[PDB]
Amino acid sequence: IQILNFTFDKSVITNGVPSVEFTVTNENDLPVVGLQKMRFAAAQLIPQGATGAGNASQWQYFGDETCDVAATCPGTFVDQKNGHYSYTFNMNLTANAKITYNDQLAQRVLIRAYNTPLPDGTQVPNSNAFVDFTADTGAAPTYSRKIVATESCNTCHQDLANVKHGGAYSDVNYCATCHTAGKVGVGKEFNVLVHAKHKDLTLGSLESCQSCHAANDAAPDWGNWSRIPTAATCGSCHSTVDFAAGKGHSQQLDNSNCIACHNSDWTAELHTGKTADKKAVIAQLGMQATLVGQTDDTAVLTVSILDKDGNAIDAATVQDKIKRLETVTNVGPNFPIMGYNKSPGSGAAKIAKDLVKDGALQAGVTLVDGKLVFTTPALPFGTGDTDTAFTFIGLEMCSTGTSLTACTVDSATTSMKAELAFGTKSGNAPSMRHVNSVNFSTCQGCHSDTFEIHKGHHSGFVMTEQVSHAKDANGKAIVGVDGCVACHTPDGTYASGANKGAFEMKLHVIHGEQGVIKECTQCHNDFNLDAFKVKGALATSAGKYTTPITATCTSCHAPESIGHGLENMGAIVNGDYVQANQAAQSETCFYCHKPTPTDHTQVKM
Ligand code: HEC
Ligand code: HEC
Ligand code: HEC
Ligand code: HEC
Ligand code: HEC
Ligand code: HEC
Ligand code: HEC
Ligand code: HEC
Ligand code: HEC
Ligand code: HEC
Ligand SMILES: [Ca+2]
Ligand SMILES: [Ca+2]
């Protein structure tokens, strides 16, 4: 009813005719009786090297038959009324026009169970199953082609049904069997197509082979990614090489020699080297910062560089290697009151100060006890949350390989661990933004753990435990994105609302247009709806403001699409600063809306 579990009991080829017997149960192992529509496919696997030295294993797709109990069925389908079924193909494999059936080769039968309901009305989910067997005894074959696991693709896609063919196939093994030479066109074989669909994408985790190639119990042949080099497969990314013509490479007329030069150790290390280089550079320094508010409302910022063990070092040791040490200071971690530009409320803009640029100290920056010190302009310190000033800090070093090097004109650079510091004018404990609803760990599956956020026009920010100030239910440090509000203020970024700069909207906007984002749980462990109590209005266009719940939901929902309207609910859409802020705690949305990350559309009627 929710899950279909297929357990195969007998799978053989009898004089060229494939036959399969299997049992179907649901999630709680209850027999499923009365299945109505299923498609059966047959294939066989050419072993590694069989078509030529160095050639990969290769599926041969005999074809498929669709069985509808209420209509046509080419084969013989038997419902034994206890959860056990049998299907005997109409096909004889010896009669295949393109493939030479060989009863010594490993065989495979695949099943797609359609979502046709049982006769009593019970709903059936679309399902995939497959079995691998030797033709005569039906036992497990001695060779296979299980390289990638559906779980790896699901890290980004959640369900492979989303990517092609109207949701028919959710098991990657089903894709890899059909996507083979002789069935799809040249270039559509799976060892070529998936490379070509990702090699030109910016998403961070795709820069590593391990995003699809890792150890998995469902993928015994997973090591083939470095051990089976082939002209077609390696050339799927190296598309400008012509091995037959010897262009961009010595001439290779076949695959017989690739592995003699391209041993798996070398292939693995050279494709994992840049990521491993970046990790070795990032591990080399840390940062500890302090922020102390003064009587004249200025704030003293002290930044100490640490070594790999966490011990402070004299910042002059590494100064000539610092490309940019970037700091941003704001007030009010739970709702910043300094805009990116001057706020309509405080009249104050965030303090953006580089401490070091191209190895040179900047104005007002001094070395004291090997630490970096800078005094900010006067800040709009106030009561409550506005007693706390906070600074988000990025550090970009010049690097080569696994080492920090002095900065030159064309030097490569690496973003280091970002730092987040808090301070007060009163001297009481600082306030801090909530982090209990967005955990940066959920970002790393798509973006990797070396996400250099805003590398390019900024120093770059790598989010680690270095910015953590809370622990989760299991005592593990929470890495939050709360530092980002230093620039993503309620008043926007540089366009003062025209780009919906506020962090409450910014990630919804940029991800609302991405197909791989489909559920709130891809970033949310929870919703902190209480945080709206401490929010004012957000700038949703240049100089115009919107009550905070409405501003958040309208990141993705056009305001006019909300049928019940917003005037009756206490909200203001692109109004005056004071007007919108006056109505900020008048929104009635949560009297009816009870969103959870799993289903945020829940309403109390
Ligand atoms: C994150 C690092 C990903 C992993 C792991 C896998 N895929 Fe992917 N895929 C990803 C992105 C960002 C895109 C761009 C298209 C989009 O807007 O989503 C894709 C694209 C594809 C496609 C192209 C057709 C499509 O539906 O987009 C295919 C056929 C595809 N992906 C399949 C696929 C398979 C089989 C994977 C496991 C081997 C897999 N993807 C992993 C992101 C990521
Ligand atoms: C046979 C029953 C198939 C299975 C199972 C899967 N695919 Fe498929 N796909 C198939 C064909 C015949 C074609 C047309 C290509 C041709 O030879 O003319 C496709 C097409 C695609 C494409 C687009 C190809 C391109 O644009 O270059 C993609 C990206 C694709 N298929 C991906 C894909 C995935 C992710 C599958 C598992 C969910 C999958 N295919 C299964 C045949 C069959
Ligand atoms: C997979 C479903 C993702 C999750 C989980 C997260 N992000 Fe994402 N993000 C994803 C895609 C496909 C894109 C488009 C850009 C691309 O590389 O294709 C983005 C975009 C961003 C950006 C834009 C700037 C950039 O570097 O591209 C940022 C800053 C960003 N995402 C941050 C981010 C955060 C903080 C996440 C956890 C809360 C997160 N992403 C998760 C895919 C996915
Ligand atoms: C997901 C987007 C992938 C990324 C990232 C990388 N590879 Fe891949 N690879 C992927 C698929 C879906 C397949 C085909 C699996 C099948 O059953 O057909 C492959 C295959 C290979 C192979 C061939 C293995 C063989 O024929 O036995 C090799 C040698 C290979 N991949 C190498 C490789 C490298 C070096 C990568 C990083 C640079 C890499 N892959 C990334 C999917 C994905
Ligand atoms: C010894 C004579 C080799 C044989 C046989 C094969 N390869 Fe090769 N290859 C070899 C070297 C010394 C290099 C350069 C390595 C470097 O770090 O500079 C290469 C290069 C490649 C590449 C990358 C090409 C590029 O990036 O422009 C690929 C994709 C490649 N080789 C694949 C490959 C294949 C498929 C082979 C069998 C047909 C093969 N190599 C054989 C050395 C040798
Ligand atoms: C000031 C130095 C900033 C810091 C700190 C952060 N961001 Fe930023 N970001 C900044 C500007 C001026 C802009 C362009 C205008 C706009 O608001 O869109 C951005 C943009 C983004 C985006 C949108 C995609 C893009 O154009 O890059 C995203 C998704 C984004 N920023 C995310 C983000 C995160 C997660 C941050 C904390 C690690 C962060 N930004 C900090 C300026 C600044
Ligand atoms: C990652 C790309 C996200 C996706 C997917 C969704 N949300 Fe989100 N949300 C994200 C960030 C970075 C923030 C800001 C955190 C902060 O400190 O300000 C938010 C915030 C919200 C809120 C505010 C309440 C809170 O917990 O802070 C709400 C109510 C919210 N987001 C709703 C929401 C819904 C309904 C989503 C699915 C459609 C959803 N978010 C996805 C990042 C991401
Ligand atoms: C992008 C990350 C979104 C945010 C932020 C919010 N919603 Fe959403 N919503 C989103 C999608 C992609 C969908 C499904 C497609 C559709 O547009 O219907 C929804 C759906 C809803 C629904 C149910 C559909 C309906 O017609 O009522 C509701 C009731 C809903 N959304 C409400 C809602 C609220 C109250 C939000 C702020 C807390 C909110 N959404 C944010 C995308 C996104
Ligand atoms: C009870 C009277 C509600 C109040 C108060 C608010 N919302 Fe609502 N909303 C309610 C229901 C039962 C539905 C679903 C019916 C529909 O026509 O969609 C909605 C719908 C939304 C949506 C999605 C609209 C769509 O996608 O078609 C959004 C984005 C939304 N509601 C937001 C929202 C806001 C911002 C509110 C406070 C200003 C608010 N709702 C109050 C019920 C009720
Ligand atoms: C897609 C991703 C692929 C796949 C399928 C192959 N390679 Fe590799 N390769 C790829 C990239 C993006 C780079 C640049 C370095 C990196 O960022 O990882 C390389 C580099 C190489 C090199 C380095 C030397 C050179 O480029 O001349 C070699 C020798 C190389 N690639 C060979 C190679 C082999 C043998 C492959 C099949 C096992 C192969 N590549 C596949 C991206 C990709
Ligand atoms: Ca810290
Ligand atoms: Ca803006």
Author numbering: 46 to 650
What does the published report state?
MtrAB is proposed to span the outer membrane and provide electrical connection between the catabolic electron transfer network within the cell, and the electron dispersing MtrC outside the cell (Edwards et al., 2018). Within this complex, the ten heme MtrC is the cell-surface module required when solid-phase minerals serve as terminal electron acceptors (Coursolle and Gralnick, 2010, Hartshorne et al., 2007). The Gram-negative Shewanella is one of the most studied bacterial genera capable of transferring electrons out of the cell to solid-phase Fe(III) and Mn(IV) minerals in order to support anaerobic respiration (Beblawy et al., 2018, Edwards et al., 2018).
To aid initial model building for the Mtr complex, an X-ray crystal structure was obtained for a soluble form of S. baltica OS185 MtrC (MtrCsol). These domains serve as a scaffold for 10 bis-His coordinated hemes arranged in a “staggered cross” formation (Edwards et al., 2015). The three MtrCsol monomers within the asymmetric unit of the crystal displayed domain I/II movements relative to domains III/IV. These domain movements centered round a hinge region formed by residues 289–300 located within the alpha helix linking domains II and III. The location of the hinge point suggests this range of motion would not be restricted in the Mtr complex, giving conformational flexibility to MtrC.
